[PDB]
Structure formats: structure tokens, C-alpha cells
Design a binder for this molecule. Structure first.
Ligand code: CA
Ligand code: CA
Ligand code: CA
Ligand code: CA
Ligand code: CA
Ligand code: CA
Ligand code: CL
Ligand code: CL
Ligand code: CL
Ligand code: CL
Ligand code: CL
Ligand code: CL
Ligand code: CL
Lengths: 174, 173, 174, 173, 174, 174
């Protein structure tokens, strides 16, 4: 159970703990199930909508959807389901999904000796990668029903820190 | 898994399945119930990579004390250790070393890549069935041939009866 | 040089010759360069728009873009660039790309002993696969400029044969 | 056209030229088409019968089936279709396919700095690998009709050289 | 938690229990976190230094570095993080990592029906494979700071058993 | 025959023609054989020395020894053997191999819509990627090293153009 052993980490310093759920490039919707302490394959997504980044969550946080706050974790090679890591916060994708706020914190591994910690801020990523992530989350439910998801904005690390802190308060309330 | 997960909605044909072996792997991985951990029992011959994902239904028992196995069919392989709700589409009636060792045939219950295209065994390519049958008829042949036999392919109602029988065995032990 | 060694094949019988350019799942836009008689990587596409099928062409055909008529070849595992095969015609995607007609013939290998020739008509494919292909071709240029590509409609094998015969005539008269 | 400028190579030295057709692990039956000078996907094979080695041919040879002599090329990672190499001859699989002889020369790359040229005879390979290759070629047409293929025996490099020389004579005539 | 459900196994018979941490070919440094009972991605390594074998540990053992004794597990295809297996001991790599002893037991799966248990000693492996493993561990920290790691020697199964028993005593005395 | 159909391209403009021989991540040493006009697997390299980038050459150029002028082509996903492309020159790895100059032009695809043409100079790349490439070429013959393998410096695109133009002159004189 990750939400009892692991804390959110050093939110003020931008180094947080993240549990990975979905390897980049997978069209398997995998989710940590808090009740069972296990990873569940909710569904198979359309192959054209494979995840453009690794997809994870922050332990001991609560968003508007009742689940832990989501993480877009960018690496060169995909991460397996179920490993956790310390990750550097570099921004936030403000996002609405079916009427509920479901923001996603953008992260890289805190210690990345493959790119030498090259991504320290959101605009260090190629602009075209941001556009692809934006397109993915704007459209990944379109084959069921279009127009229910909306990437609202991209925020820096300080706005991401504020989002994480609010999600921490929700967890502490519950 | 056998403490948190139940077999699920067997009457509705939507069961819980825990994946052990990704499709295409020649690693014989099994959930060790005594230790609550996944064990690589052995490396199989590469020519006998699993033709489908391979898993089990929690809280079920074969007649000989074995878990009730699941052949889970997907386009891309599933990792070891993920669980899912799965649609029962049939049963491979199977004998291994004289022991009944049936395998429930399943797909993910929510498949938005093919739009839940497979609901019965006849929805699958008959040639996929023949490959699965060949695999389980021969995968032990390099050690000793003739010890495994695919007896028949049953529909979803027969599969449900096999699941319910295995639920009873679990309950009684 | 495939346009000299290969004819279109048995168009009336629905078994044609197809030369593969792009493996399914690749975001590399590879095209047969008829002038040089070699395969050219035109550009890298966004990774979110990896090709949903193999992409190929029919020898000795001309569509309106001045290239050979395109083929969407559906297989379980991707086909390498530069291999040719006899393929069963199962339909056609009517398509307009940046002002011009650029229809694509939908094909499977003529001899498929993996699925036992399971796909003979478009209705044999999962509808959700067609919907994914439609979405891909409706959106794959959106990061440069949206609204320039349109999947007009889908036809069956006799409609596809008519398009092939029209492109054979354009080749002969070039 | 590989048969125009590529020769069979140093048959007496056991270092021959091989053109690869099928990557190890592929279920795509790809064949060099001599008349067109291009690689043709003849058919998709059952996924359970993916090739257990790379599959290639010797230029300017002819076996009894009318094509160039086949090569089983063993490597740790698959080779792409259409690459040629100098290969060390380590044995021959004597083979009958649907009535006619279709022997296959067993080779490794002549220059392997990953394993330090570890394989010089068939006995240097894991015996279980040979048994897997034999099973594959004994069964790969079974879903169409069983019993039409037979691995007759395995020979060493000298029998392989004799087979190659007979195939060079067929090409010349 | 592996250190409570698993013993080291049949050390005297050379068949020990091993828990896999890093799949061969991965540049993700994954470690079993004993305090959290979970696998942690410590850092991304340079891709040029992808692990040449699977990398794991023996439960209920301690080496000089304070972690469980390491294992180099050689397989034809990589093993996933988090699986455990009975492994045959075939050798030991004697190794110093920044002034600390950190030997690694060389193992293969005890039941290998793909190669028919072809590897029983180090001399059964290609000598070039050993040289590559040696190169890797002599150089994998070089982009940070070179000259801090040294493969000291390669021992057989009997020396490996002695190393295992010493690590069992260290664990027992903790 | 790529040396007859293709020219070096627009050297002054920095957009040249490149033929790919080796996919990134491959340990297969594949070379275009000018005598036969075909791609040859010269040898299997140690797996620990897989190519860190795609590896290719510029048509109609010669090193001072008669070697074709090599290309390090950087992409996110490996390119297949045998395709050619227009590529942007972004730098040069000055390199000495066995007592001879053996420079390698650093390139990216000229039209990269996955990263949005993010890389125009060497400094645009993560500097840790450069250090990994440097380590690779300094050490890839270490298992049996018969001569120098030394990266002498990293040059910009203007120095790279001078190297290309010198190699065009040698080719024309031959
Ligand atoms: Ca969420
Ligand atoms: Ca069973
Ligand atoms: Ca076109
Ligand atoms: Ca043959
Ligand atoms: Ca250690
Ligand atoms: Ca050179
Ligand atoms: Cl990972
Ligand atoms: Cl998965
Ligand atoms: Cl292919
Ligand atoms: Cl290759
Ligand atoms: Cl595995
Ligand atoms: Cl570093
Ligand atoms: Cl490619």
C-alpha cells in the first residue's frame, strides 16, 4: 500500500514521490486501486490513443475525481507499472474531464543521468511535445463521445506546487 | 489477491482475473498463493511462448488444488501482476498429466480498441483457436510428448459452470 | 524498380500487388521515390500520429497527387519497408488531403494463415478499427494546420476496384 | 539482383555469402524472388510458428524446390530482411518438405565479437535449441495438413559443404 | 515483503532464492526499498550503460554496502521487476564500488528448458560475455566520475557460496 | 546505387542527403557496400556497444583513406537500414580511428514534426547525450583495441560543412 508507506515528499522543494501506473506508449488504462492496494486494468483504450507520457499519481493526495492527483512523467524510455520514484515538478496541465477538475502534474525523474537533468522547467521540453500531449488529452475519449475533455492551460512549477498542496489538504480532510 | 478480490460477477459473465504471464513470453510465471508473490517457475522453450496472456481467477480451485487458469486474449500483452474485470467467452477443456486443468477464455470487459468485438468463441478467428489448441497440445513435447490434451472448446455457459464448480472447491477448503 | 517489375495484379479478382512503405506503428513518413527508385524518409511525424496500419502503394497506378495509389494494409504485426506482396482488396477510404483526392485502398495479405483469411470485407474488421483509422487520417496534420484533411466515406471491394481501374488508366496515359 | 554480383563465397573454407530473408521471431514468410529481384511476403504464418532463427539463402545456388539453397542463420538479435553477410558454416539440417528435399545450411555470422565466435559446430549450440528448430520444421505446416515435413538428420560442416557444392552445380546447369 | 516470506534458499546445494530488480537491457536503476517494501527507481542511468544482465538480490542477506547481496541473473530474454525465482549459482563477480565491497553472485534460472540448463559454471558462458559484464561494471559511473569501480576477479560457485553465507551471517547479526 | 542516384545535396544550406545504415540501438555493424550496391552485415559488435544514434553516410563523399563520410543521425525512434533522407547538419564529431581521420557529421532529419525541429546546433541537444556519444566512440573497440579511438573535439555546423566539402573534393578526384 503506497499511500501509507509513502508520503507526497518535498512539495516545497519540488521533489515529490510518484507511483507509476501506465508506461508511455501503452493503450492499457491501468489505475492504482486504493481499496485493494493493487493495479487494475480498467479498460483497453484505442491503440491510436496510447499514452504520450508515463502516467502516475502522487501518494496521499486527493483531486476532484476522488482519486489521487495524476502525474505526467516524461522519460526517454517507458517506466513499468508499479515502481515509484522521486520526481522533479516542472509544471502542471490544467485539465477538465467530464465536468470535473483533473489537473496533471508534469514531472521528470529527479535524478536523470540519461539527459543529465536537462528538463528543469516546462519550456525546456520541445514545444511540439506539449502540443502532442495537449492533443491527446483533448481527444482521447472522442471515439465514445467528443467534447468532454479540455486542456485549459499549462502552468509552471509554482502553480503546480499550489495544486499539489490543495490535493494534500483534501487527503488530510479524508 | 485471494483475500481482496472475489471471483466477481460469475452469473453475469464478468469475472476478476489476475494476469501472470504476458502473451508472447516464454517465462512460466505463477502466483504463489502461500507467499503472495509472483514466481518464475522456469524458462520454457522459446518456440512455446504463450499464445495469449495467462492468468487466474481468485478464490477458485481445480480438483487437484490448482488455481483456475485464464487465457486472456488482447492485441498487446498485459504485464504480470495487473488485475482486471474480464468477459467470459468460453472454456478450453484441458487435461494435463491426467488432471483436469481447464482454462477459462476471456477478453477485457471494457475493450475500446476493438469495441468489445469478441463475445463468444465464434467471434474469434477459428485459426486463432487452432493455434491455442496446438500450443497446449504440444508445449511439453521437448520433455515428454503425449501428456497434455485439449479435449473440447465450450461456450460461456459451460465456462460459468466450471467457474462455479471451482468456487465450491475453494469454499470447501 | 517496382513499377517495372510489378503490374497492379489481378484487379478484377481483387488480388493486387502492393509495395509496403511504412510499417504499422511507425511515425516515419517513408515514400517510394519513383525517380530515384529508392525509399525516402520524407519527415518525422508526431509520435501520437503513428500510422494505424501499414502504408503502401500499388505499382503502375497514378492518383491525383501524382504518386501511385496508396494502400492501407492491415496486419497483426508490422511489415518492413520495401517488401511487396499479393493483397486482397477489401475496401477503399475516400479521402481529400489539402485540396486533392488521395483515396487509399484497404487491403490484407491474400494468404493469411495466422487468422485463416478472416478478413474479406470491411464488415469483417472491427468497426472500432475503422473508426480509429478515420480519426487518424482526419487529424494527422492538425499540429501544423487543422481542417485540411477529410475522410469522405468508405466503400467496399467493388468501389475499390473502380478506383484502382481509374488509377491504372491515369498511369497508362501519363 | 543478389545472384548477379554475389557468389556463394569460400565454400571450401566454410565462409559463405548469405542473404537474409526473414528476421528471427517473425511470422512473415518472406522470400527473395529471383525473377523480379525483390523480397516478397508470400504469406502470414501462424504466430505460434514464428521462425526460430533468421532465414536466408545462398546466392547462385539451387535446391530441388527450384529456389536458392536455404540458410538457418543463428544470432542473438534478429537480422533485417535484405542484408547480406559472410557466414560461417557450422552444419546442415537435412529436410524433406512435402515430397521434396529442402535442406538448410546452419550458419552463424563469420565475425561475431559479441560472443567471440563461440559457435563453430552444431554441438557448440545448446542441444535444446537444435531440438526446438527440429520441432519447428517438423510442425510448421500442421495447421494446414500435418505429416508432410520431416527433419531427417543433422550433419556437420563437411556434409554441409557437400550439399552446398551440389547446389552450386544445379545453378550452373 | 520478500525478506520475510523468502529465505536465501538452498545455499549448500547452490540453488538460491533471487528477487529481480532490473530487467536486462534497462537503463533504469531500480532497487528494492526494504523500509517501504516497494521497488524504487533511484535514477535514470545513461542509455549507453543499460544493464548487461538482469539485476536482483538474495533475501535475508546483507553485504558491506548495507543492502542485500546483489545478483547478476543471465537469461536470454529480460525478466520483469518484482518476480522471484529459484536460481542456480554459477559464479561470483568480486567488486569494489567507491571503496565499499559489493560482490555480485552470478546466477541463471535453476530450471531453464530453453537452453536445457546449458550454463553450470562461468566457463560455460562466452568469455566475451564476461568481458562485457566486466567492462560495464568498470565504467558505468564514468560520466559522473571515473576510476571509482573495479571488478577485482571472477570466482566459481564455491567462492560464491562462501560470499552468500557471510552475507547471511551479516543479516542474522542485524 | 545510392552513390549514382543521390548527390550530397545542399551543403552550403546545411541540408544534405544521408543514407542510413544502422538503426540506433543495434549492435549489428551494417555498411553500404559500394562494390556490390547492397548493405552488408560486416560483424556483430559487443551488445554493450550498441550504436547510440543512427549511423549512416553521405553519398559521393570520401574520407582521406577512401572511407565514406560517416553520419551520426539523431532521432527519437530508430531509423531502418536502407532509407535515405534530407538531413540538417548540426555539427561534427572530430574523430581519429586507427591512426586515420574518421570524422562523423552530426545530423537530424531536416523535417522533424515530432520535436518541431528543436535541434539546430549541438548545444540544443542534451549535453549528456553528447557525452554518451563521446564515450561510445572512445571505447567501442576496447575489447580488442588495435589503434586509437579518440574523439578530438566537437565542431559546429560551419566546421562540419568544411569537412563535407573536403570529402566531396576527394570523391570527385577519384
Ligand atoms: Ca485522475
Ligand atoms: Ca489449473
Ligand atoms: Ca498519396
Ligand atoms: Ca527452400
Ligand atoms: Ca549492492
Ligand atoms: Ca569514415
Ligand atoms: Cl522500468
Ligand atoms: Cl499492461
Ligand atoms: Cl516484415
Ligand atoms: Cl540487422
Ligand atoms: Cl518476465
Ligand atoms: Cl552523470
Ligand atoms: Cl524507419
Amino acid at each position: 500500500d503506497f499511500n501509507q508507506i509513502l508520503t507526497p515528499g518535498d512539495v516545497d522543494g519540488g521533489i515529490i514521490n510518484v507511483v507509476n501506473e501506465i508506461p508511455a506508449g501503452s493503450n492499457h488504462k491501468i489505475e492504482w486501486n486504493r481499496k485493494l492496494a493493487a493495479f487494475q486494468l480498467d479498460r483497453i483504450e484505442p491503440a491510436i490513443f496510447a499514452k504520450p507520457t508515463n502516467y502516475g499519481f502522487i501518494p496521499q493526495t486527493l483531486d476532484e475525481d476522488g482519486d489521487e492527483l495524476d502525474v505526467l512523467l516524461v522519460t526517454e524510455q517507458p517506466l513499468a507499472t508499479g515502481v515509484f520514484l522521486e520526481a522533479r515538478v516542472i509544471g502542471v496541465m490544467k485539465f477538465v474531464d467530464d465536468g470535473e477538475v483533473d489537473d496533471k502534474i508534469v514531472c521528470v525523474p529527479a535524478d536523470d543521468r540519461n539527459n543529465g537533468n536537462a528538463y528543469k522547467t516546462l519550456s525546456d521540453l520541445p514545444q511540439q511535445l506539449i502540443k502532442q500531449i495537449e492533443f491527446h488529452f483533448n481527444h482521447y475519449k472522442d471515439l465514445k463521445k467528443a467534447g468532454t475533455t479540455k486542456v485549459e492551460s499549462w502552468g509552471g512549477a509554482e502553480e503546480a506546487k499550489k495544486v499539489i498542496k490543495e490535493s494534500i489538504e483534501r487527503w488530510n480532510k479524508q
